[PDB]
Amino acid sequence: MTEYKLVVVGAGGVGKSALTIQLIQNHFVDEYDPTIEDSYRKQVVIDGETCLLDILDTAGLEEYSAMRDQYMRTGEGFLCVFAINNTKSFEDIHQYREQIKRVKDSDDVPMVLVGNKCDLAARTVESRQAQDLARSYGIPYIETSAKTRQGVEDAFYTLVREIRQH
Ligand SMILES: Nc1nc2c(ncn2[C@@H]2O[C@H](COP(=O)(O)OP(=O)(O)NP(=O)(O)O)[C@@H](O)[C@H]2O)c(=O)[nH]1
Ligand SMILES: [Ca+2]
Ligand SMILES: [Ca+2]
Ligand SMILES: [Ca+2]
Ligand SMILES: [Mg+2]
Ligand SMILES: [Mg+2]
């Protein structure tokens, strides 16, 4: 059966691990845990296709990771995650997209822009801003909450559907 290699990237603390664990185990990690497994596997049915999600949960570029570039090279699709209550994390997205462009040696990489923590009231990044950034990359924008599950399945399933177009 088909395997989709997904890589989750973005700034420290935007909720890369919380999103991936909410998808894989239907649990919200409500604390900072500095030692979470990077590799997740799940057999799922997406649009009538039985397939394997192979998910690599990376560290932010500010954190030193020796396995990051190995994870980068093998990725078929990328979730580029910022938090809607973290302007710096949104600004940082360009650097993650440039790194992806560098490693895939293409500007036509399957990607989804994810605005996480959409449950939180302290919004500093407007939907419109993120839509505009995603448009400039030729990719969809999806808002998620790792806490409430809003958009989580949609973010990962949309990325699979983007890989299928490539
Ligand atoms: N309210 C709310 N909190 C969230 C959401 N997603 C993550 N968090 C919280 O934000 C903090 C950081 O989450 P975490 O998943 O570890 O972020 P990360 O991007 O993997 N950090 P790192 O790059 O260091 O691995 C945690 O306390 C987590 O509970 C969300 O959607 N809503
Ligand atoms: Ca807990
Ligand atoms: Ca741990
Ligand atoms: Ca290159
Ligand atoms: Mg993490
Ligand atoms: Mg503003």
Side-chain angles (χ1 to χ4, degrees), residues 40-55 57-63:
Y40 308 62
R41 295 173 56 99
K42 197 180 186 178
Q43 173 167 309
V44 295
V45 186
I46 304 174
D47 304 312
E49 175 182 278
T50 302
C51 55
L52 255 286
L53 306 189
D54 187 339
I55 307 176
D57 170 27
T58 67
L61 280 184
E62 76 290 304
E63 208 178 300

Side-chain angles (χ1 to χ4, degrees), residues 127 129-134 136-151:
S127 179
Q129 290 175 273
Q131 293 178 34
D132 287 355
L133 180 56
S136 83
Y137 298 158
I139 70 180
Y141 173 59
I142 300 180
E143 288 200 349
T144 64
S145 177
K147 183 166 176 192
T148 72
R149 296 189 54 81
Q150 181 166 38

